């Protein structure tokens, strides 16, 4: 009747080291009240990418994200991507210049090494503090990141200079919130600023904190409190 | 008429290095309005243990806890123990198997090196993803911690394998909150998740943050704001 989809990282499952962990947890899920085929286990291998286009399969999605300082990705940036509904298009930095439209039009770029330099254009296609000809005059706004949500003064055209060799930059519109998902973060006291806006900080119920000890423990808790977690989504 | 009991760690007093610090502070306490014998000074030497069975002596208890990253104990786990009313019984991992009953039945183990492996039993005393015979098939949920509050899927029996040599594991029921106590934490911005439940995060008045500089300063502040601190407990 209803379905629960658990998203975790590879490292999570690797640490568990059992060929039947998905199965054991499933029987344990009957306890909390979910029928034999009612729960599904999806394995994301690369969080950054998954966060962008996370093909959510089930009715209820609870995604496990473990703070990993050895990857240099911002938890906030990742939350902002999963917790929300984004809609991206591709950008051709080579032939076209771009401009963001509203507080919801952002440039999300990600890859090996993302280095973005920008040059604002006046209404003539001329630089403002830069020469659209020599990128040595551009303004650097990202130096080799793995995930970057860039924000420029709305309503202004910009010649962009990304290192497309190792990066991919796409033009995204954030249309709202996703109700069928939840974020459960493991580790790092870290408070999440998921607003581009320095003014606001929203803290929702679909944004939960578990204290890391071992992965088996994490899953036991997720199971022992499935309804509590589900109730925070349906609420 | 009323009594105030200050709990601090040894290091706190050692840094103060005076044979009359308890006395000096006491005269200073008359200022804030507490009679010559109205305040008591209790020295906990081991926070982990104290947090479990803290024989609270006075009417008002304000306990000083200093974030110490060189001990690997979770502040949240420690808060969860002091701030609340727990009631434990001993567990014999050798002869019996166990199961937690409600969102309030947890297994709190602590010692030199606590390493807990678990094996869920179906209604036959048979393993589920494990052989109750070889602990190499168990599920590890704690690898050498100094304090551990373990949580398993409620209503399921488990053969437990703790390293009782260096650890002690006891079955605790959390019956509620303690009103005569307060936690004043020193250091670490750290926000405290004192719920086993990933869904909720409760922040109470009896859970206060002081910025560390020197211990003498900490005590001066505690004295300079005794009533403010007391009012947060009686409130």
């Amino acid at each position, epitope marked *: 009747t209803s379905t629960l989809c658990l998203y975790y990282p*590879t*490292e*999570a*499952a*690797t*640490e*568990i*080291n*059992d*060929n*039947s962990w998905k199965d054991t947890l499933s029987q344990l899920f009957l306890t909390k009240g979910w029928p034999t085929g009612s729960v599904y286990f999806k*394995e994301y291998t690369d969080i950054a990418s998954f966060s962008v286009d996370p093909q959510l399969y089930c009715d209820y999605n609870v995604v496990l994200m473990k703070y990993d300082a*050895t990857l240099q990705l911002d938890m906030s940036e990742l939350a902002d991507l999963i917790l929300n509904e984004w809609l991206c298009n591709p950008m051709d930095i080579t032939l076209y210049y771009y401009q963001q439209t509203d507080e919801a039009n952002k440039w999300i770029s990600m890859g090996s090494s993302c280095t973005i330099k920008v040059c604002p254009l006046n209404t003539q296609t001329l630089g403002i503090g830069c020469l659209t000809t020599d990128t040595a005059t551009f303004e650097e706004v990202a130096t080799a990141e793995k995930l970057v949500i860039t924000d420029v003064v709305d309503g202004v055209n910009h010649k962009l200079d990304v290192t497309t060799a190792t990066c991919t930059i796409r033009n995204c519109k954030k249309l709202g919130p996703r109700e069928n998902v939840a974020v459960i973060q493991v580790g790092g006291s870290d408070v999440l600023d998921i607003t581009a806006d320095p003014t606001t900080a929203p803290q929702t119920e679909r944004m939960m904190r578990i204290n890391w000890k*071992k*992965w088996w423990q994490v899953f036991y808790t997720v199971v022992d409190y499935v309804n509590q977690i589900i109730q925070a989504m349906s609420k | 008429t009323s009594t105030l009991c200050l709990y601090y760690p040894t290091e706190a007093a050692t840094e103060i290095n005076d044979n009359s610090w308890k006395d000096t502070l006491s005269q200073l306490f008359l200022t804030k309005g507490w009679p010559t014998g109205s305040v008591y000074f209790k020295e906990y030497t081991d926070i982990a243990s104290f947090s479990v069975d803290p024989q609270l002596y006075c009417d008002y208890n304000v306990v000083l806890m200093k974030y110490d990253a060189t001990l690997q104990l979770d502040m949240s786990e420690l808060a969860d123990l002091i701030l609340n009313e727990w009631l434990c019984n001993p567990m014999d991992i050798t002869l019996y198997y166990y199961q937690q009953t409600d969102e309030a039945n947890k297994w709190i183990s602590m010692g030199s090196s606590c390493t807990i492996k678990v094996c869920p039993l179906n209604t036959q005393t048979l393993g589920i993803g494990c052989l109750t015979t*070889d602990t*190499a*098939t168990f599920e*590890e949920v704690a*690898t*050498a911690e100094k304090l551990v509050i373990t949580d398993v899927v409620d209503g399921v029996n488990h053969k437990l394998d703790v390293t009782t040599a260096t650890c002690t594991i006891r079955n605790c029921k959390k019956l509620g909150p303690r009103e005569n106590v307060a936690v004043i934490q020193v250091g670490g911005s750290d926000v405290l998740d004192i719920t086993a439940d990933p869904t909720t995060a409760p922040q109470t008045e009896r859970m206060m943050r002081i910025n560390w500089k020197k211990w003498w300063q900490v005590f001066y502040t505690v004295v300079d704001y005794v009533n403010q601190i007391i009012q947060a407990m009686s409130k």
Partner: antibody, heavy 121, light 108 residues
Framework: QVQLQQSGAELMKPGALVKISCKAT????????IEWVKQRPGHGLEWIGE????????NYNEKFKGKATFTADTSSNTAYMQLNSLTSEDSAVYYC??????????????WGQGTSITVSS | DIQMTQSPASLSASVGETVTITCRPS??????LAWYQQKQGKSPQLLVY???TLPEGVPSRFSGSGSGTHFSLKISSVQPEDFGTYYC?????????FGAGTKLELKR
């Protein structure tokens, strides 16, 4: 381009204890389990146990529990196995292989070169 | 304790011929069987996992098959590079146990 390099060969006196080591290169050391296999001339391959560096999970073949004890240094990127109370029959070749990821559990894909121990008074 | 039973203990053939080693576990290894090849004076090398799947590098004349209590490996157009010892191991959870081994010799 993954690779585990084990320490050099040694020869202890009966009763002593030794330290083998495996150094990882080419993968996130903390994210994969390390296996330990014993190989005597006429006994094929014996599994000893495994260890998960970082988290610290450990598993012992019931038959080695007393003899072997694993450790791992994350800063070093090396896993260690220590054989206690050496016997003339502990003499053999010891390997350390990487236990693949979540995909397929317990399939060792990369093997060390092999360390060699000889107990003889 | 799952007991792997490798046969034959020794096999003998010349290049081009098609041999077939065979592992038979005491219990039911669902399909969690592997095959490693070890060459004279070196280390083992994963050659086949989950019964029939081969890692990447590995040639394709190497064919794994079976499930349950019967499994088989099947080197086909044996070339001079396929001569040495072959082991089989189940990977259905600890404790892991290996085969006895099959030694493939060069006929003549």
């Amino acid at each position: 381009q993954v690779q585990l390099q084990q320490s050099g060969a040694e020869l202890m006196k009966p009763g002593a204890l030794v330290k083998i080591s495996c150094k990882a290169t080419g993968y996130t050391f903390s994210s994969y389990w390390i296996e330990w296999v014993k190989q005597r001339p006429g006994h094929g391959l014996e599994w000893i146990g495994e260890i998960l560096p970082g988290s610290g999970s450990i598993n012992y073949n019931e038959k080695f529990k007393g003899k072997a004890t694993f450790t791992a240094d994350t800063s070093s990127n090396t896993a260690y196995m220590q054989l206690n109370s050496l016997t003339s029959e502990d003499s053999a070749v010891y390997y350390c292989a990487r236990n693949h990821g979540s995909p397929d559990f317990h399939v060792m894909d990369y093997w060390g070169q092999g360390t060699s121990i000889t107990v003889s008074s | 304790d799952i007991q792997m039973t490798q046969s034959p203990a020794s096999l003998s053939a010349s290049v081009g011929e098609t041999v077939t080693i065979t592992c038979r576990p005491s219990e039911n290894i669902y399909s969690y069987l592997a095959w490693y090849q070890q060459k004279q004076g070196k280390s083992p090398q994963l050659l086949v996992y989950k019964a029939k799947t081969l890692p990447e590098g590995v040639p394709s004349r190497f064919s794994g098959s079976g499930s349950g209590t019967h499994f088989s490996l099947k080197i086909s157009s044996v070339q001079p590079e396929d001569f040495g010892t072959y082991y089989c191991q189940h990977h259905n959870g600890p404790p892991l146990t290996f085969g006895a081994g099959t030694k493939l010799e060069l006929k003549r």
